[PDB]
């Protein structure tokens, strides 16, 4: 381990071995000094115009962190295509992480003149929250992950966290965490860091779409032996009185047939069209938003439980806050136009999951008698019911991979709503920080903590290797399947490539459900 | 294996060994040529009067299939009685299936004169969908199962299936399956077929009724140490003002007592009386029906989640679509009269499950203050809640046995709603078909597929043996239990026997819950 | 491997061992940052004046590459002379490549004042395209190879490639390649790199000229026993009528003699004289150029198939685009004068290959009869014919060595037309790049890829050792052979040496065919 010796090589590749695929990606990173080496209490109350739904109390820290919770951090577009076009499923098995070729640079600023040089003896500090003692900030769809394109140099995100709050104030249970309290490895140029991790057992992601629907599992050609109430009143003319008539469900009465299952849970969202002219002329994104109520404040149930984005022929419709939406390259942070973002679609699950913008179904609302007509009620919120079956939200090339399951007494189907794998012991948080280097101190002793430091930052490479287990497709479907494919005809540029300006871009969201499977 | 040698014997019997009972039944079957040896696209759209709730797209195939998913296919009435009167539970363990004494006959039709003869060299084809690659059509309560009566010769059902559809059209994900794509055993008279299967671990069916109710589990003689808000206002006369009074639940206030559990989930159905005069005079079977909404179309939640058919003393009431209904011998397929069908009753579960035609309970609907009286809301749809306990629908001698659990990311309490055992790997589908035998072809070559075949059908016997594990009763109940019993006094015929015409009939539905068990 | 230790020595030499000769050359190189560390889509359509024949779509990359596909990269002039004056042939067997004594320097630019210093902790990245997954850019006669003169420091070429295009647009099949996707070795000053490679079996290059011609292989002294049609009409005066006369080819009728072979294939090029006055006064270089037509665009067949540059006594003539042409030291890039370039000559193959500017031969063009005189057609394009024999283009001291045979279903005599050895698995491409080193990043996190980098470049030495197998000459020719020789009389400077200015130059092209061989 010396100044003149590399401490690691560039490992970027993918190998397919059978029921496994191993991805490996390396990137060059840059880490500045955050918070001026300080920890700062940050808060936001209800003063000014800040609403109560957005209050918070927490801290910003001088630390940065590595994040690769995004599929494109590991799969190239072509690899993603190889995965989704041929496998009914897949899942993470184990990973290796490495930090190397570290270099700490210090910048001198005198008379407009700026010079940067190495500080051969400075160190960075690194450690993993292997015992999950820090607030788990990963799994919240934050920016700062390794770039999709291998040639892009990225900046390391700053670590910050939240605790309990009451307005802009802290409460008795509010917790303060000092990351310097943890043992951490100190590396100088020449030193490297690495660790291994094994994923817990988790189900394969459903990278397939159903080629059958819950309400169409019977034999088209045979009647049931079971009967259903088919008539409640006579029909012979005008002397119509009450009676009781029963019939057997059959090919023409599939909606009446007795069935064994029920569609998945529902939490109805407001519908909105991509054809603005068809929408009400008001600003309802928030006022008509589907939300949950937690201790006084409201949050969008975004994207909320997995529901079909729209029913047959209505591609223009989508749940106001019930789908993942990515931005196109350079889309504005605020009020970006529809043509600057990319809406995803969980259309593939219409097959088992209720459509996100409609009722779950209908229930009786009273007791009918001869003097009281029967009444019905529309169900727009339907929790788990015995016999329900459903699918989870799909995952995307540019979407999240996993999330830490909250440590609670209970929960229900812990599949992270934004999509992905829910893990009790997810990949550990990897914290990194440039060690503060005092600028000359006074010549006579003083109690005060130093606050004058040499200006510096660090850079180096990072590698992440993940082994994935594949669940091969075993279909007897005779006719060809749907497959993700590149466009055929000429185009100004190549999809999933760089610009004349060297800018890489992801033209569209790529899901995972192309192959089909029976129910 | 020769023309003159039987390839199997008649095995029909039952043996009880302790915590096991083995059923064995053989039947004679007949298989015609279906679809003229062809596969046909079948569809039903929204034209004519066909409603959208009944649209579909699928295929009919030239294949038949064996089905024995009906308890009476294995248990004789007496055996069913032996089972339900002495065991708290039971479940399937393993099975053996066999096809033998196969004979293919061809029929010649010339001048009104019809003759049938053997075609000693023809074959039938058989195979099991052991990898569940075909749409699983069993578990939809279709007719065509082996007959309850051993002497009845039955016809084999034709196999057909459904895929996705949009009206009467197919969509991109629609799948087409060719059963000739699968390896299959070909048998001539003299050949036989057989296979073995083992049921996955599954809970014992609850063949018992609770002799206690969820709201009556306390000691009748002792007060709780816990208190409840008992008074909100003074009582001394007319100067009545707000106050706070607390009391301890006790023998006379069992409805107020603190309890540990909640009744099972609810999805309220409209009530209907068997005394037509008490019903509203309108045709509400469908309009007031309890349904679920899936991709644009509605289906009856039939019979839906398990709920008590009626409360105390109301045997005349039942959920419009919340109970299994069987027909009596020869009941019409359409608009059969009440006296021609047999309604089942889940009355035994009033003990833990909400009554199907009433509310789950009551919740607060606002925040009361001195100027605002408290308001309440009736709950008619209640999904899973921590602390709930419930029972499943009972199974019946003439009811279904199992159903394949849909292949989905999630589900909740996968007990098939029509009743029975939910299995991830249920008994495989057994497909059978008579091999097409060309009638003379032209004398000079022609591209076209032959469409002229010898007319023939097949017949033979089929055996199914299933081993069931019994959960013996261990009750300390002092007084006698309720038991299913034959009627004592004279009758025109014998229940569960044949007619003067040789017709077998099942006079009533026979449940499984006679013995009792504490909560 | 340290900052103060050399990681390799200077190996420049040649050793002759018998049927082998091992060349070894080392050079000092310099590598700048290319494309500002970016990948850029580059294109050229049909707008402005750009013709369709020159359209293209591809990418420029931040990578450089090593190239030594030029004989003078390995053989000194004297060594080349030792080779060509004594061997009938030779070929590459194996090679060793090495990168060492690497130094990365960073340049600071403040107030017109420029300073360069070491960046002891920076790295370069290197890797070989050992599986031929990148577009093979070598073998296209590009500049950037190691210099002929060992003392010259050279600049490393930038890597770029082309894919399919339609005008200036890309198409569906267009491919984008990221070199950071490949595993690569990272070296700091002190680290080194190296690899070994073995050439596939390939024929010896024909470093000889034939001392016999295809049409002169018979015995000068003996008649053939075979006859040929020698007369078609009588000769006795004016009563001349048709007849049939046959004769035996002999010493005076060698042009009529029956022969076993045919001259090599032909693709006639337009002739041009070095005496401008003898040329047509028009600009026909392109309009009269010999070309091939591929998907809408035309390319010069340059130099095209191997054909003799000129026939006897016409050294002044040459195919407009059918010979290799090198420039003299400092010849302009555009419109260089005839006296500034050096034309090569494949004159040695007149012996078997058609002359490049004349017909292949003559064929019948009709069916002659007594009323129809026979007609003939001149053949200017003649593809492979049974019995043909030919020679390939010679190779030159300053010419290319090998080319990768295109991966296609078929091909014919895959000897690269520009000259050299055609290999299915040629020496791998060696890619190199300076790793980007971020200049200080912002102090608060930002999504954007860094675009501010420290200015730097690298330098070091490179070694290439190749082992060549020689095919010794075994001639019984009595009289001396032609040999390449230095001029005898006084001259201003020494051929193949430096200037008074220190500039090395190659005064002339040196072929390989001096010794002779019978057919
Ligand atoms: Na694409
Ligand atoms: Na009876
Ligand atoms: Na010379």
PDB file of C-alpha atoms in Angstrom, chain A residues 109-301:
ATOM      1  CA  UNK A 109      -6.962  30.186  -2.655  1.00  0.00           C
ATOM      2  CA  UNK A 110      -4.748  33.289  -2.981  1.00  0.00           C
ATOM      3  CA  UNK A 111      -5.509  36.463  -5.134  1.00  0.00           C
ATOM      4  CA  UNK A 112      -8.153  35.029  -7.489  1.00  0.00           C
ATOM      5  CA  UNK A 113      -5.455  32.435  -8.197  1.00  0.00           C
ATOM      6  CA  UNK A 114      -6.622  28.889  -7.329  1.00  0.00           C
ATOM      7  CA  UNK A 115      -4.317  25.863  -7.110  1.00  0.00           C
ATOM      8  CA  UNK A 116      -5.077  22.242  -6.229  1.00  0.00           C
ATOM      9  CA  UNK A 117      -2.503  19.762  -4.977  1.00  0.00           C
ATOM     10  CA  UNK A 118      -2.284  16.407  -3.260  1.00  0.00           C
ATOM     11  CA  UNK A 119      -2.164  16.025   0.482  1.00  0.00           C
ATOM     12  CA  UNK A 120      -0.448  12.721   0.524  1.00  0.00           C
ATOM     13  CA  UNK A 121      -0.874  12.313   4.309  1.00  0.00           C
ATOM     14  CA  UNK A 122      -4.616  13.087   4.675  1.00  0.00           C
ATOM     15  CA  UNK A 123      -7.246  10.439   5.361  1.00  0.00           C
ATOM     16  CA  UNK A 124     -10.875   9.662   4.612  1.00  0.00           C
ATOM     17  CA  UNK A 125     -12.966   7.670   7.073  1.00  0.00           C
ATOM     18  CA  UNK A 126     -15.289   4.824   6.121  1.00  0.00           C
ATOM     19  CA  UNK A 127     -17.561   2.463   7.958  1.00  0.00           C
ATOM     20  CA  UNK A 128     -20.696   0.381   7.529  1.00  0.00           C
ATOM     21  CA  UNK A 129     -23.737   0.637   9.798  1.00  0.00           C
ATOM     22  CA  UNK A 130     -23.671  -3.171  10.014  1.00  0.00           C
ATOM     23  CA  UNK A 131     -25.784  -3.240  13.156  1.00  0.00           C
ATOM     24  CA  UNK A 132     -28.359  -0.800  11.803  1.00  0.00           C
ATOM     25  CA  UNK A 133     -27.874   1.704  14.587  1.00  0.00           C
ATOM     26  CA  UNK A 134     -28.226   4.842  12.454  1.00  0.00           C
ATOM     27  CA  UNK A 135     -31.430   6.099  10.848  1.00  0.00           C
ATOM     28  CA  UNK A 136     -31.671   4.137   7.592  1.00  0.00           C
ATOM     29  CA  UNK A 137     -31.800   6.843   4.959  1.00  0.00           C
ATOM     30  CA  UNK A 138     -31.477   4.563   1.926  1.00  0.00           C
ATOM     31  CA  UNK A 139     -34.749   3.362   0.408  1.00  0.00           C
ATOM     32  CA  UNK A 140     -36.341   6.817   0.086  1.00  0.00           C
ATOM     33  CA  UNK A 141     -35.619   7.282  -3.616  1.00  0.00           C
ATOM     34  CA  UNK A 142     -32.979   9.975  -3.075  1.00  0.00           C
ATOM     35  CA  UNK A 143     -30.553  11.161  -5.752  1.00  0.00           C
ATOM     36  CA  UNK A 144     -26.849  10.505  -5.340  1.00  0.00           C
ATOM     37  CA  UNK A 145     -26.654   6.857  -6.419  1.00  0.00           C
ATOM     38  CA  UNK A 146     -23.899   5.630  -8.712  1.00  0.00           C
ATOM     39  CA  UNK A 147     -24.646   6.964 -12.263  1.00  0.00           C
ATOM     40  CA  UNK A 148     -26.220   4.678 -14.913  1.00  0.00           C
ATOM     41  CA  UNK A 149     -23.382   5.536 -17.309  1.00  0.00           C
ATOM     42  CA  UNK A 150     -19.947   4.186 -16.217  1.00  0.00           C
ATOM     43  CA  UNK A 151     -18.022   7.194 -17.529  1.00  0.00           C
ATOM     44  CA  UNK A 152     -19.894   9.737 -15.390  1.00  0.00           C
ATOM     45  CA  UNK A 153     -18.086  11.035 -12.317  1.00  0.00           C
ATOM     46  CA  UNK A 154     -20.515  11.593  -9.465  1.00  0.00           C
ATOM     47  CA  UNK A 155     -20.735  13.545  -6.243  1.00  0.00           C
ATOM     48  CA  UNK A 156     -21.357  11.750  -2.944  1.00  0.00           C
ATOM     49  CA  UNK A 157     -24.641  12.661  -1.166  1.00  0.00           C
ATOM     50  CA  UNK A 158     -24.541  14.218   2.277  1.00  0.00           C
ATOM     51  CA  UNK A 159     -25.969  12.195   5.162  1.00  0.00           C
ATOM     52  CA  UNK A 160     -28.752  13.714   7.223  1.00  0.00           C
ATOM     53  CA  UNK A 161     -31.632  12.265   9.232  1.00  0.00           C
ATOM     54  CA  UNK A 162     -34.885  13.056  11.029  1.00  0.00           C
ATOM     55  CA  UNK A 163     -36.269  12.260  14.532  1.00  0.00           C
ATOM     56  CA  UNK A 164     -39.472  13.109  16.226  1.00  0.00           C
ATOM     57  CA  UNK A 165     -40.734  16.662  16.208  1.00  0.00           C
ATOM     58  CA  UNK A 166     -43.566  18.864  17.360  1.00  0.00           C
ATOM     59  CA  UNK A 167     -43.714  21.714  14.916  1.00  0.00           C
ATOM     60  CA  UNK A 168     -40.133  22.925  14.605  1.00  0.00           C
ATOM     61  CA  UNK A 169     -39.237  21.740  18.079  1.00  0.00           C
ATOM     62  CA  UNK A 170     -37.747  18.469  19.245  1.00  0.00           C
ATOM     63  CA  UNK A 171     -39.442  16.308  21.874  1.00  0.00           C
ATOM     64  CA  UNK A 172     -38.252  14.091  24.708  1.00  0.00           C
ATOM     65  CA  UNK A 173     -37.777  11.034  22.501  1.00  0.00           C
ATOM     66  CA  UNK A 174     -35.850  12.889  19.831  1.00  0.00           C
ATOM     67  CA  UNK A 175     -32.524  11.176  19.196  1.00  0.00           C
ATOM     68  CA  UNK A 176     -29.205  12.716  18.247  1.00  0.00           C
ATOM     69  CA  UNK A 177     -26.578  10.582  16.503  1.00  0.00           C
ATOM     70  CA  UNK A 178     -22.865  11.252  16.191  1.00  0.00           C
ATOM     71  CA  UNK A 179     -21.252   9.215  13.406  1.00  0.00           C
ATOM     72  CA  UNK A 180     -17.798   9.741  14.944  1.00  0.00           C
ATOM     73  CA  UNK A 181     -19.020   7.501  17.718  1.00  0.00           C
ATOM     74  CA  UNK A 182     -18.645   4.457  15.522  1.00  0.00           C
ATOM     75  CA  UNK A 183     -15.437   2.613  14.798  1.00  0.00           C
ATOM     76  CA  UNK A 184     -14.314   3.570  11.285  1.00  0.00           C
ATOM     77  CA  UNK A 185     -11.461   2.659   8.969  1.00  0.00           C
ATOM     78  CA  UNK A 186      -9.072   5.487   8.149  1.00  0.00           C
ATOM     79  CA  UNK A 187      -7.435   5.388   4.737  1.00  0.00           C
ATOM     80  CA  UNK A 188      -4.660   7.430   3.176  1.00  0.00           C
ATOM     81  CA  UNK A 189      -3.944   7.337  -0.570  1.00  0.00           C
ATOM     82  CA  UNK A 190      -2.693   3.793  -0.924  1.00  0.00           C
ATOM     83  CA  UNK A 191      -5.154   2.215   1.506  1.00  0.00           C
ATOM     84  CA  UNK A 192      -8.397   0.541   0.417  1.00  0.00           C
ATOM     85  CA  UNK A 193     -11.652  -0.671   1.924  1.00  0.00           C
ATOM     86  CA  UNK A 194     -14.040  -3.540   1.308  1.00  0.00           C
ATOM     87  CA  UNK A 195     -16.766  -5.727   2.663  1.00  0.00           C
ATOM     88  CA  UNK A 196     -19.051  -8.613   1.861  1.00  0.00           C
ATOM     89  CA  UNK A 197     -22.771  -8.985   2.379  1.00  0.00           C
ATOM     90  CA  UNK A 198     -25.366 -11.701   1.899  1.00  0.00           C
ATOM     91  CA  UNK A 199     -28.999 -10.973   1.118  1.00  0.00           C
ATOM     92  CA  UNK A 200     -31.605 -12.695   3.244  1.00  0.00           C
ATOM     93  CA  UNK A 201     -34.012 -15.092   1.594  1.00  0.00           C
ATOM     94  CA  UNK A 202     -36.532 -13.160  -0.411  1.00  0.00           C
ATOM     95  CA  UNK A 203     -39.096 -14.118  -3.097  1.00  0.00           C
ATOM     96  CA  UNK A 204     -38.239 -13.740  -6.763  1.00  0.00           C
ATOM     97  CA  UNK A 205     -39.550 -10.521  -8.251  1.00  0.00           C
ATOM     98  CA  UNK A 206     -42.450 -11.198 -10.592  1.00  0.00           C
ATOM     99  CA  UNK A 207     -40.883 -10.264 -13.919  1.00  0.00           C
ATOM    100  CA  UNK A 208     -43.884 -11.491 -15.879  1.00  0.00           C
ATOM    101  CA  UNK A 209     -47.470 -10.505 -16.661  1.00  0.00           C
ATOM    102  CA  UNK A 210     -50.474 -12.759 -16.201  1.00  0.00           C
ATOM    103  CA  UNK A 211     -52.029 -14.088 -19.411  1.00  0.00           C
ATOM    104  CA  UNK A 212     -55.226 -14.865 -17.491  1.00  0.00           C
ATOM    105  CA  UNK A 213     -57.506 -12.775 -15.278  1.00  0.00           C
ATOM    106  CA  UNK A 214     -58.970 -13.679 -11.864  1.00  0.00           C
ATOM    107  CA  UNK A 215     -62.505 -13.606 -13.246  1.00  0.00           C
ATOM    108  CA  UNK A 216     -61.693 -15.867 -16.210  1.00  0.00           C
ATOM    109  CA  UNK A 217     -60.206 -19.062 -14.738  1.00  0.00           C
ATOM    110  CA  UNK A 218     -63.070 -21.416 -15.584  1.00  0.00           C
ATOM    111  CA  UNK A 219     -63.630 -23.815 -18.423  1.00  0.00           C
ATOM    112  CA  UNK A 220     -65.413 -21.863 -21.209  1.00  0.00           C
ATOM    113  CA  UNK A 221     -67.311 -24.888 -22.275  1.00  0.00           C
ATOM    114  CA  UNK A 222     -68.850 -26.362 -19.131  1.00  0.00           C
ATOM    115  CA  UNK A 223     -71.613 -25.267 -16.752  1.00  0.00           C
ATOM    116  CA  UNK A 224     -71.058 -25.209 -13.002  1.00  0.00           C
ATOM    117  CA  UNK A 225     -73.032 -27.658 -10.851  1.00  0.00           C
ATOM    118  CA  UNK A 226     -73.500 -24.755  -8.462  1.00  0.00           C
ATOM    119  CA  UNK A 227     -76.525 -22.436  -8.719  1.00  0.00           C
ATOM    120  CA  UNK A 228     -76.979 -18.729  -8.051  1.00  0.00           C
ATOM    121  CA  UNK A 229     -80.066 -16.592  -7.409  1.00  0.00           C
ATOM    122  CA  UNK A 230     -80.944 -15.533 -10.968  1.00  0.00           C
ATOM    123  CA  UNK A 231     -84.488 -14.187 -10.597  1.00  0.00           C
ATOM    124  CA  UNK A 232     -86.338 -12.318  -7.861  1.00  0.00           C
ATOM    125  CA  UNK A 233     -89.534 -11.383  -9.702  1.00  0.00           C
ATOM    126  CA  UNK A 234     -91.811 -12.941 -12.337  1.00  0.00           C
ATOM    127  CA  UNK A 235     -91.681 -11.742 -15.940  1.00  0.00           C
ATOM    128  CA  UNK A 236     -94.986 -12.818 -17.715  1.00  0.00           C
ATOM    129  CA  UNK A 237     -96.388  -9.222 -18.252  1.00  0.00           C
ATOM    130  CA  UNK A 238     -97.749  -6.746 -15.671  1.00  0.00           C
ATOM    131  CA  UNK A 239     -98.902  -9.047 -12.853  1.00  0.00           C
ATOM    132  CA  UNK A 240     -95.212  -9.239 -11.857  1.00  0.00           C
ATOM    133  CA  UNK A 241     -94.721 -10.347  -8.247  1.00  0.00           C
ATOM    134  CA  UNK A 242     -91.828 -11.667  -6.206  1.00  0.00           C
ATOM    135  CA  UNK A 243     -90.524 -15.177  -6.800  1.00  0.00           C
ATOM    136  CA  UNK A 244     -87.236 -17.064  -6.504  1.00  0.00           C
ATOM    137  CA  UNK A 245     -85.382 -18.337  -9.571  1.00  0.00           C
ATOM    138  CA  UNK A 246     -82.017 -20.103  -9.648  1.00  0.00           C
ATOM    139  CA  UNK A 247     -79.627 -20.908 -12.480  1.00  0.00           C
ATOM    140  CA  UNK A 248     -76.251 -22.499 -13.162  1.00  0.00           C
ATOM    141  CA  UNK A 249     -73.402 -20.246 -14.208  1.00  0.00           C
ATOM    142  CA  UNK A 250     -72.112 -21.120 -17.655  1.00  0.00           C
ATOM    143  CA  UNK A 251     -70.163 -19.782 -20.653  1.00  0.00           C
ATOM    144  CA  UNK A 252     -72.504 -16.824 -21.141  1.00  0.00           C
ATOM    145  CA  UNK A 253     -72.815 -15.985 -17.458  1.00  0.00           C
ATOM    146  CA  UNK A 254     -69.200 -15.921 -16.311  1.00  0.00           C
ATOM    147  CA  UNK A 255     -69.850 -12.787 -14.265  1.00  0.00           C
ATOM    148  CA  UNK A 256     -72.386 -14.751 -12.182  1.00  0.00           C
ATOM    149  CA  UNK A 257     -70.288 -17.893 -11.743  1.00  0.00           C
ATOM    150  CA  UNK A 258     -69.153 -18.930  -8.293  1.00  0.00           C
ATOM    151  CA  UNK A 259     -65.422 -18.272  -7.923  1.00  0.00           C
ATOM    152  CA  UNK A 260     -62.715 -19.054  -5.375  1.00  0.00           C
ATOM    153  CA  UNK A 261     -60.866 -15.748  -5.202  1.00  0.00           C
ATOM    154  CA  UNK A 262     -61.137 -11.975  -4.847  1.00  0.00           C
ATOM    155  CA  UNK A 263     -59.053  -9.165  -6.430  1.00  0.00           C
ATOM    156  CA  UNK A 264     -56.342  -7.504  -4.359  1.00  0.00           C
ATOM    157  CA  UNK A 265     -56.832  -4.649  -1.846  1.00  0.00           C
ATOM    158  CA  UNK A 266     -57.918  -1.170  -2.919  1.00  0.00           C
ATOM    159  CA  UNK A 267     -57.316   2.486  -1.909  1.00  0.00           C
ATOM    160  CA  UNK A 268     -58.922   4.536  -4.726  1.00  0.00           C
ATOM    161  CA  UNK A 269     -56.972   7.437  -6.247  1.00  0.00           C
ATOM    162  CA  UNK A 270     -58.308  10.326  -8.316  1.00  0.00           C
ATOM    163  CA  UNK A 271     -57.985   9.858 -12.076  1.00  0.00           C
ATOM    164  CA  UNK A 272     -56.268  12.351 -14.386  1.00  0.00           C
ATOM    165  CA  UNK A 273     -55.859  12.400 -18.171  1.00  0.00           C
ATOM    166  CA  UNK A 274     -52.747  13.245 -20.164  1.00  0.00           C
ATOM    167  CA  UNK A 275     -55.143  15.179 -22.444  1.00  0.00           C
ATOM    168  CA  UNK A 276     -55.434  18.253 -20.217  1.00  0.00           C
ATOM    169  CA  UNK A 277     -58.687  19.309 -21.914  1.00  0.00           C
ATOM    170  CA  UNK A 278     -60.435  16.314 -20.299  1.00  0.00           C
ATOM    171  CA  UNK A 279     -59.484  17.393 -16.762  1.00  0.00           C
ATOM    172  CA  UNK A 280     -61.426  19.602 -14.382  1.00  0.00           C
ATOM    173  CA  UNK A 281     -60.090  23.135 -14.509  1.00  0.00           C
ATOM    174  CA  UNK A 282     -58.767  23.522 -10.957  1.00  0.00           C
ATOM    175  CA  UNK A 283     -55.567  22.739  -9.057  1.00  0.00           C
ATOM    176  CA  UNK A 284     -56.450  19.441  -7.391  1.00  0.00           C
ATOM    177  CA  UNK A 285     -53.109  17.583  -7.249  1.00  0.00           C
ATOM    178  CA  UNK A 286     -53.049  18.038  -3.479  1.00  0.00           C
ATOM    179  CA  UNK A 287     -56.653  18.747  -2.539  1.00  0.00           C
ATOM    180  CA  UNK A 288     -57.884  15.658  -4.395  1.00  0.00           C
ATOM    181  CA  UNK A 289     -54.783  13.638  -3.570  1.00  0.00           C
ATOM    182  CA  UNK A 290     -55.034  10.212  -1.920  1.00  0.00           C
ATOM    183  CA  UNK A 291     -53.375  10.524   1.471  1.00  0.00           C
ATOM    184  CA  UNK A 292     -52.824   8.916   4.860  1.00  0.00           C
ATOM    185  CA  UNK A 293     -53.215  10.685   8.186  1.00  0.00           C
ATOM    186  CA  UNK A 294     -50.376  10.252  10.717  1.00  0.00           C
ATOM    187  CA  UNK A 295     -50.230  12.198  14.002  1.00  0.00           C
ATOM    188  CA  UNK A 296     -51.767  15.408  12.784  1.00  0.00           C
ATOM    189  CA  UNK A 297     -50.068  15.507   9.388  1.00  0.00           C
ATOM    190  CA  UNK A 298     -51.030  14.210   5.981  1.00  0.00           C
ATOM    191  CA  UNK A 299     -48.901  12.532   3.355  1.00  0.00           C
ATOM    192  CA  UNK A 300     -49.614  11.464  -0.146  1.00  0.00           C
ATOM    193  CA  UNK A 301     -50.024   7.696  -0.320  1.00  0.00           C
TER     194      UNK A 301
END
